[PDB]
């Protein structure tokens, strides 16, 4: 409170100093299940080139 | 469905010569790289000789190396084969087979699929 009134005497009353806000425990990243490949073991797989 | 039917062989004797003829229906022989097998008589099945699609990579059979040729008339749409200076251990039925995975994307072993009826040529006295 003296830090934020800028001033070394703070006299009788209720003050607003600052917010507080719950921080985030973890991280989420949600996509589709991976699904239509594309052909690769296809080509170095070739039997005949 | 596809046929590859055999025709020319049957008996001979031992020196003479004689052609084998292959004909296919139902497709287009002309880009099926083809290769014969031979059978003796009451045995197994034996390699013969090797055309490609190409034309340009042919691979024969150690014993008929050196004569024995094979072709292609893509005009009549068959595979011939010339036996020239039979001897007496040639006598077998004959094969005229063509090769499965004929594609460029394949990832699939080889396997002759179409097989052949099979004719059978003697040689003796």
């Known amino acids: 409170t003296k830090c934020t009134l800028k001033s070394f005497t703070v006299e009788k009353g209720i003050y607003q100093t600052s917010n507080f806000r719950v921080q985030p425990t973890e991280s989420i990243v949600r996509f589709p299940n991976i699904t239509n490949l594309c052909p690769f073991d296809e080509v170095f797989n070739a039997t005949r080139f | 469905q596809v046929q590859l039917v055999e025709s020319g062989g049957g008996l001979v004797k031992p020196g003479g010569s004689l052609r084998l003829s292959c004909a296919a229906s139902?497709?287009?022989?002309?880009?099926?790289?083809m290769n014969w097998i031979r059978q003796p008589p009451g045995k197994g099945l034996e390699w013969v000789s090797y055309?490609?699609?190409?034309?340009?990579?042919?691979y024969y059979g150690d014993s008929v190396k050196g004569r024995f040729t094979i072709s292609r008339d893509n005009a009549k749409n068959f595979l011939y084969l010339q036996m020239n200076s039979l001897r007496v251990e040639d006598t077998a039925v004959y094969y005229c087979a063509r090769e499965q995975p004929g594609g460029y994307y394949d990832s699939s072993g080889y396997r002759l699929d179409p097989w052949g009826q099979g004719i059978l040529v003697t040689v003796s006295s």
């Open positions: 139902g497709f287009m022989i002309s880009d099926s790289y």
């Open positions: 055309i490609s699609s190409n034309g340009y990579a042919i």
